Each structure stands twice: as structure tokens, then as C-alpha cells.
Amino acid sequence: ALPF
Amino acid sequence: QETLEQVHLTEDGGVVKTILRKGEGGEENAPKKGNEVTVHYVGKLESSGKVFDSSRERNVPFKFHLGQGEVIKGWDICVASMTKNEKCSVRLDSKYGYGEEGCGESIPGNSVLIFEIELISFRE
Amino acid sequence: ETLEQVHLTEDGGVVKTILRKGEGGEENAPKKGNEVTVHYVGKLESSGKVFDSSRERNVPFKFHLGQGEVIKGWDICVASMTKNEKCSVRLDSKYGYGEEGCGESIPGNSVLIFEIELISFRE
């Protein structure tokens, strides 16, 4: 998550 | 006795791409900023060699827009350097991944990440 | 956006920064013994001062790849090039003129930087  | 060409995509040696399979050689085959890229990838820590993330395990390609912060820094830099059907192994230093915090149990703070990334296709 | 430099040795004494990519065919790749035609600019890393340039002379330089006609770093660098590739190669002391250097223009233990454009070659 944030980001991948 | 074959050894593979690894290219430094940053000046700090924090993104080093080893090309396992070369892509296609045309300009048409090179993805531009904002293009929707389709990739398959496998993400493992350098130290443990443990897979934390794989689109292959999922058997579903991953789609994103190149050069727009939709993915960790290292990916935007690495995919920008790839061509259609190129397969690679990119070594990512902490600051090109999840930084000092890391991410969840699977990625500790200051992890070197290694991603194998195959650029399947792209489009506008 | 930053440029892709590649280490052509295991001691970090030949690092090539490709400024302009060449042609991507095998027909465009030069083999050992091939006469290569190049343009280059040679400057010291520290002073940034040009000691040698084929461009000043306005005439390309011709040599045979892989035969010790040129300092080590060149043979290694040009071997990794393809037609119309331009580049900036960083050469450590042992891949150039070593502990002695070469005349006034190149001191002992100089790190050399060259901008090498591979114009053509032939068999």
C-alpha cells in the first residue's frame, strides 16, 4: 500500500 | 562462463537492472510516460530470498500507468527502461522501495528488494 | 530521469555511461580484429581538461579492436559498443597510463574520462  | 549485463539506472547504484531476457528492439516497442503497462512480477527480499509478492502466484497480470507514482520509485525507473517482452531482475535499494519503514511483516525497514519484471504489453 | 552506466570490469575501473544508444542489430556489433572508426574526447576526471581529441583534429581515429593498439580501457569499452553509440567511459589508472601516466598531459594515477562515439567498423 502506497504504492506497490 | 556467461555473465549478464547489469545496468545502473540511477547514479547512487540503488536501481541495478540485470536483463535476463531482452525485449523487442523497436521504438514502437518502448513504453512512454502515462502508458498503461501490463507486467508480471515476482518480488523477493535480497537477504532472505523470500517472495513477498508475485503476480505469477496470483496468475493475474498487473496493470499500471508508467511514470506517475502508481508504483514504488524503482518500478517507474526500471519499467521506463524496458521494451516489449523484456524480462529482468532489478535490485532496489531501500529508498527506491518502502524506505526506512518497510511494509508490513513481509518487508522490514531498509530492505533491499529484488523484482523479476516481465513487460508483457502496453498501450495508450 | 538519469543515465544508465555499466561496469565492464569487476573492479569498477571501467564504467561506461551511454549518452546515445547505438544500433541494436548483431550486424552492428564489432568483433575482435575489426578495424573500428571512432571519434573521441579524452579529459582528466579531476581537472576536466582535454588532453586528446579526434574532434579538435576533425578526423576520426581508426584502430583494430582487441589487440592492444589502444590502452586497455578502450579495447574493453569499444568491445561493448554498437554502431553510432556515443558514451562517456570512466577509466581508472590501471586501465589507462598507470602509475607513470603519459607526458605532462597525463599524470601518474590519473582517472581518465573519454567520450567515445563509434562511427563505423569493418571486417
From TrEMBL, chain B:
Q: Which domain of life is it from?
A: Eukaryota
What residues form the membrane-spanning segments?
Answer: none
Using the record's annotation, list all stretches that form the PPIase FKBP-type domain.
34-123
Q: By what name is this protein known?
A: peptidylprolyl isomerase
